C-alpha cells in the first residue's frame, strides 16, 4: 500500500540509513509493495532460516537425521549462544540446533549446523541450486555480521530473500513435513518481540526470524496473515544507522503497524 511506502521512507529519515522492503503474496509470489528490492543488505541471523532449510533438504534426501546428537566443546562457543552454552556435556540433536538457531538466534547452533553441510559455500551452493543466484554466505558466526559498507559478503536482496523464503515454505523444494517444521520453528521465534510481532494483533499468524549486526544492521523475514494463517511474506533490512537498538526496533514495528493497517 502507498501509505506503507510512506512509512518505509520515513524510517530511512529516522534511522539515517537505507531500508529495503518487500511484500509478496504467499500464494501467487506477486510483489505487492517494494522499496530498494534489488539492493544488497547484510542478512545477519536471517540466514539461519535458509541454513535450516538446507538441513531439512538433506533430511528429505536421506543425508541427515533430526535425531542425530552432536557433541562440541568450550572452544566452539561464540558470542550469543544462550542454548548451546548449556549443553557442553550432553550435546544437542540437529532438531534442537535448528530450534536454537531459529527460535533463539543461537550463533554456535548456526556454526555447528554450517559444519554439518560443509560450511558457508555449501549453503550458497544450496541457494544457487534452488535458483537464488544473489543470496550468498561467505563467513561463520560472528564475522558474517560485520556489515562493511559495499561488501557483498553475507548479503541478500529483499526480493531474492522473499522469493527464497516463499520457495522454502510453500514449494515442492522441501517435503510437506519439512515445510511444516521450518514454519513451526519460525512461528516459535522468541527474540523478535519488539519488531513485527509488537504491531501484530491477536488472531494473526506470524512466523519470522530477526537479525542484528554491526553498523546498525537490523532485519526481519516473516510469513504472516490474518485469521491464524500466513498469506504474505515481508522482508525488511536496514544497515548503516547510528540509531539505538530501541529506535531501529521502533521503526520496523511502525512499518509493521502500517502494513497491518493497510492490509
From Swiss-Prot:
It catalyses: a beta-lactam + H2O = a substituted beta-amino acid. It is an enzyme of class 3 (hydrolase). InterPro entries: Beta-lactam/transpept-like, Beta-lactam_cat, Beta-lactam_class-A, Beta-lactam_class-A_AS. One of its GO terms (molecular function) is beta-lactamase activity. This protein is used as a marker in many commonly used cloning vectors, such as pBR322 and the pUC series. Disulfide bonds join 52-98. Its EC number is 3.5.2.6. Changing residue 14 to K: In TEM-2, TEM-3, TEM-8, TEM-16 and TEM-24. The beta-lactamase present on pBR322 was cloned from plasmid R1 (R7268). The class A beta-lactamase family has a specific amino-acid numbering system, sometimes called Ambler or ABL numbering and often misspelt as Amber. A multiple sequence alignment was used to derive a consensus sequence and then the consensus was numbered taking into account insertions and deletions. This allows use of identical numbers, e.g. for active site residues, despite differences in protein length. UniProt always uses natural numbering of residues, hence there appear to be differences in numbering between this entry and some papers. TEM-type are the most prevalent beta-lactamases in enterobacteria; they hydrolyze the beta-lactam bond in susceptible beta-lactam antibiotics, thus conferring resistance to penicillins and cephalosporins. TEM-3 and TEM-4 are capable of hydrolyzing cefotaxime and ceftazidime. TEM-5 is capable of hydrolyzing ceftazidime. TEM-6 is capable of hydrolyzing ceftazidime and aztreonam. TEM-8/CAZ-2, TEM-16/CAZ-7 and TEM-24/CAZ-6 are markedly active against ceftazidime. IRT-4 shows resistance to beta-lactamase inhibitors. NCBIfam families: bla_class_A (NF033103), blaTEM (NF000531). Belongs to the class-A beta-lactamase family. This is Beta-lactamase TEM. The lineage of its organism: Bacteria, Pseudomonadati, Pseudomonadota, Gammaproteobacteria, Enterobacterales.
Amino acid at each position: 500500500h502507498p501509505e506503507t511506502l510512506v512509512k518505509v521512507k520515513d524510517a530511512e529519515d529516522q534511522l539515517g540509513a537505507r531500508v529495503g522492503y518487500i511484500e509478496l503474496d504467499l500464494n501467487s509470489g506477486k510483489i505487492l509493495e517494494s522499496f530498494r528490492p534489488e539492493e544488497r543488505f547484510p542478512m545477519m541471523s536471517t540466514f539461519k532460516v535458509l541454513l535450516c532449510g538446507a538441513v531439512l533438504s538433506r533430511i528429505d534426501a536421506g543425508q541427515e537425521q533430526l535425531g542425530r546428537r552432536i557433541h562440541y566443546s568450550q572452544n566452539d562457543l561464540v558470542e550469543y549462544s544462550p542454548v548451546t552454552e548449556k549443553h557442553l556435556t550432553d550435546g544437542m540433536t540437529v532438531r534442537e540446533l535448528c530450534s536454537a538457531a531459529i527460535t533463539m538466534s543461537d550463533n554456535t547452533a548456526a556454526n555447528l549446523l554450517l559444519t554439518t553441510i560443509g560450511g558457508p559455500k555449501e549453503l550458497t551452493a544450496f541457494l544457487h541450486n534452488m535458483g537464488d543466484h544473489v543470496t550468498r554466505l561467505d563467513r561463520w558466526e560472528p564475522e558474517l555480521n560485520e556489515a562493511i559498507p559495499n561488501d557483498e559478503r553475507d548479503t541478500t536482496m529483499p526480493a531474492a530473500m522473499a522469493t527464497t523464503l516463499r520457495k522454502l515454505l510453500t514449494g515442492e523444494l522441501l517435503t510437506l513435513a519439512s515445510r511444516q517444521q521450518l514454519i513451526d520453528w519460525m512461528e516459535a521465534d522468541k527474540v523478535a518481540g519488539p519488531l513485527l510481532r509488537s504491531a501484530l494483533p491477536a488472531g494473526w499468524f506470524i512466523a519470522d526470524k530477526s537479525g542484528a549486526g554491526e553498523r546498525g544492521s537490523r532485519g526481519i523475514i516473516a510469513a504472516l496473515g490474518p485469521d491464524g494463517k500466513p498469506s504474505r511474506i515481508v522482508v525488511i533490512y536496514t544497515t548503516g544507522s547510528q540509531a539505538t537498538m530501541d529506535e531501529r526496533n521502533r521503526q520496523i514495528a511502525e512499518i509493521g503497524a502500517s502494513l497491518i493497517k493497510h492490509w
